[model samples]
Target: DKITLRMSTPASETDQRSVALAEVFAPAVAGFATYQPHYNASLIAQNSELEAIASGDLEMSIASAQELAQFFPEFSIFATGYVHQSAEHQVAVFNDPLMDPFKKTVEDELGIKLLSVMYLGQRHVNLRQTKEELTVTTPADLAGVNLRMPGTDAWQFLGKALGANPTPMAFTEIYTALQTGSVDGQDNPLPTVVDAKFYEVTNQVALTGHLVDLNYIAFSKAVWDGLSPEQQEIVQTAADAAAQSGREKQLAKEQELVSFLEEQGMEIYAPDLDAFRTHVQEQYVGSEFAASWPEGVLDKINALG
Candidate 1:
């Protein structure tokens, strides 16, 4: 038997890390498949990722909170700077018994089943400009500037907390936007910023130690339902392998890139962030947006801590 599954990624064929997962991990797990396996892969963008999969346009896709959050505003309830703080607790929110109900609700509500979440950004700020003209010692320092952000509520709330405007742009458009001065600055994990070369445009990088990001892999539940038990195992194994491979490469690449950015003149700072914490509490406690969510949902996720 032969079956071709559709897969999509933001990375192109030339992206060594992503392609390596496709080539090495996929083929490595093919032996576990009950049928002959082939994957038709396509390049896609951030917000479009979950939409594509949810609509059954693709069998599999990778989505970020920034990208998928536009369509799913509730996404901020679960990403970096929201919901849980540490990566460990972040994982708990996905697997904990207490979270099982909410996770099921997300799938039932969105028509998208998130299969696995790959840890992506241990995120901080990186700037191409200068260090201390007007430093961001706390979120208060950014009270008036506009920030380039993803479409997620995390950034929307974070931008408001940090005292900046949340400027949502396609990930691909960031370099040009920063270059032409359409936005004052951009924020992302160090890997993405360096890979996209954000270090060459802005001046100050505030390494706020703000959030831990786990990029998601989602598939239509309808498609998963069609697969045999054996087929599902092959896919799960393949996906797990790919996730591990991605994490390994990210760890090694981050070390190299951080060293390179220092040489490239990007100033990385460890700012005091108590003000950001204080603001998130104030905003989350009494705001209309906060009222829209299930009460104590974040509190329960935080309980894993």
Candidate 2:
């Protein structure tokens, strides 16, 4: 029997994440399965994919570290700022034995398998103030600045750790907030800045690169168990290849956007990342979120980098 692997994601088909799965995973598994991708969350709502997959209603979906954290709190370690040093470091950490417990918990508890990690680009601080008006070289520079962050406890904690006063705001209200001085700055990957036209309202982008975000190519464990040994190999290899392909494109796009933003008259520059990293990580120490992380796992993750 031919399996139909239907993937549901909130991202559009043009997104490199979707493109990679279409170009690499689909073709590689074509002999045994039909890879049907439903982009823009046409088949399932955003952040609800894992539940759908676990219930046997969906076959596959792209999962984020933040989303996975909701199911297992320890996953918040991966979502935290500065945990993943770079895109390459993310792959290294995922493939490391340290990830075994993390992955095992998800598979055993959620009936979902994370086949590979996809780079989601690094999030940075984008501000409405001009570089001349407010030059941010360290976390201390952000003191008292109202930064708009997603209205989630985890996200707000990260915003505070960055040394800014975190303001919980809906995604739809960022541009208006920035324009109206309701929030002095917001944090997102450069791709988001361009896509949301934040460059038009923001005057500078402080390359804090605080959070190197990631997504996993998650599949249903039940479906995965049903596959033959050879089919499983093919599917795993295909997902890995797709993640690699998507990573390369996203990396290039981020680099390209730097120049594009500069051309748009936005002052883009890297802040004192070491300073930010040290300060942010120190803030996470002994917090409720950090309590979820397993003993010695953070050191193991850092060792991989």
Candidate 3:
């Protein structure tokens, strides 16, 4: 029997997620299945992949942790601003003991299986206008700034809590949206902003480091459960290897891309990350949405570092 591995990434080959699928995942699973890759939201909308997987409409997808947080608030830990101090800390959270239950939650409640943690690099605020025009020196400056976030409650609320008028939109539309004045700004990791060449439409890069960006490699449980045990192991092995290689590629390119963006005439501003960290987290706590996590969840993640 022939098997086809269907995977979708919200970005192009220039995007790390796509690189993971092409260079690692596709190759690892090739002997067992034919590889099909759909890039830049060509297969399905970015925000819809998780539901598609759960419903068995898609076999595999690279899903934003922020979007998953909308349905499973406990998963919002990935998107909550300032929870991770660095990429090292972010990876630590993945291997942390606490992650086991979170993994179980996805499989038990969402009908999906967690495969690997794909690094998104550290997220920053990118505005369409130059730094001088926007003057985003602090969270106070972010007031009323129309910041583009993925169309998900957790993402939108995180933007709002960080002091912006959250504008929800598709990732593919972000550049055109900014160019046409449909939205004033968007947030993404440095590598993403550069790979997407968002600098052409956006002029300033704020070092917000709000989310130490991460996404999950998710397989449809409906499909996964039907696979033989040996087949399942093959998928998991491929997913794990793909994640490791993908993160390495992302880390290596980040600094060079930062320089690349600057050469493109985009102003890079380093905001008071501490100020943003201190203020942004307060809004999430004591809210009903964040109450989804078991008690001490944040403390557990915080203690990891």
A best-first ranking of the candidates according to their lDDT comes to: 2, 3, 1
Best by TM-score: 3
2 or 3, which is superior by TM-score?
3
Clashing pairs in 2: none
User: Which residue pairs clash within candidate 1?
Assistant: 128-202, 129-202, 129-203, 130-203
Model 2 over residues 205-243: C-alpha lDDT tens digits?
999989998999999999999999999999999999999
Model 3 is weakest, by summed lDDT over 10 consecutive residues, at: 1-10
Candidate 1 on 210-278: residue-level lDDT in tens?
A: 666776666677766777897777776676667667766766666677767778777777767677666
Best by lDDT: 2
In order, the Cα lDDT scores of the candidates are 0.64, 0.90, 0.82
lDDT of 3 by residue, 108-208 (tens): 98898888888888878899878888877678998889999988888888799878999888888888998898888998888888788788898898888
- Candidate with the larger TM-score of 1 and 3: 3
Model 2 segments more than 4 A misplaced = 144-146, 167-184
Which ranges of candidate 3 are over 4 A from the true structure?
none
Backbone collision count in every prediction?
Answer: 4, 0, 0
The stretch of ten residues in a row with the least summed lDDT in candidate 1 is 33-42
Superposition TM-score, candidate 1 onto the true structure: 0.83
